[PDB]
Design a protein around this ligand. Sequence first.
Ligand SMILES: O=c1[nH]cnc2c1ncn2[C@@H]1O[C@H](COP(=O)(O)O)[C@@H](O)[C@H]1O
Ligand SMILES: [Ca+2]
Ligand SMILES: [Ca+2]
Ligand SMILES: [Ca+2]
Length: 130
Amino acid sequence: TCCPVNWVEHERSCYWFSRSGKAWADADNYCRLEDAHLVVVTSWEEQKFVQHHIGPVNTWMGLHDQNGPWKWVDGTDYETGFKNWRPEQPDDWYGHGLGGGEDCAHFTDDGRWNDDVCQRPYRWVCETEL
Ligand SMILES: O=c1[nH]cnc2c1ncn2[C@@H]1O[C@H](COP(=O)(O)O)[C@@H](O)[C@H]1O
Ligand SMILES: [Ca+2]
Ligand SMILES: [Ca+2]
Ligand SMILES: [Ca+2]
């Protein structure tokens, strides 16, 4: 009863799943304007719940290394926290030829994470805490 309309409640958090794509910085701005942040996944249980609602689609999360080390957007510690990288990721790939490596994390079609080019338009998930 405390999540906004069209948001999904799960373990004291509210989630909004986009049905359109945006570059990471744009999806980040979108979530912030809803008094929310790009989804911060801290457990296997929260990972399975997000997977259920996104399906087999590349989807941005609130994890990036644009300024150096890996950081979650709300300040949640990366080093000591949950990780679900696909084997061989993050790899900071430059071979896409678009400039730079790969600095934004997204869920891949099977749920496991990948670092990709932040400019790519992907769907995204916003999260707010109750
Ligand atoms: O041609 C390639 N060479 C090396 N790695 C690649 C190549 N294409 C894609 N990748 C890797 O695969 C990731 C994309 O994962 P996907 O979007 O699930 O296919 C990229 O971010 C790179 O890590
Ligand atoms: Ca969370
Ligand atoms: Ca990087
Ligand atoms: Ca990658």
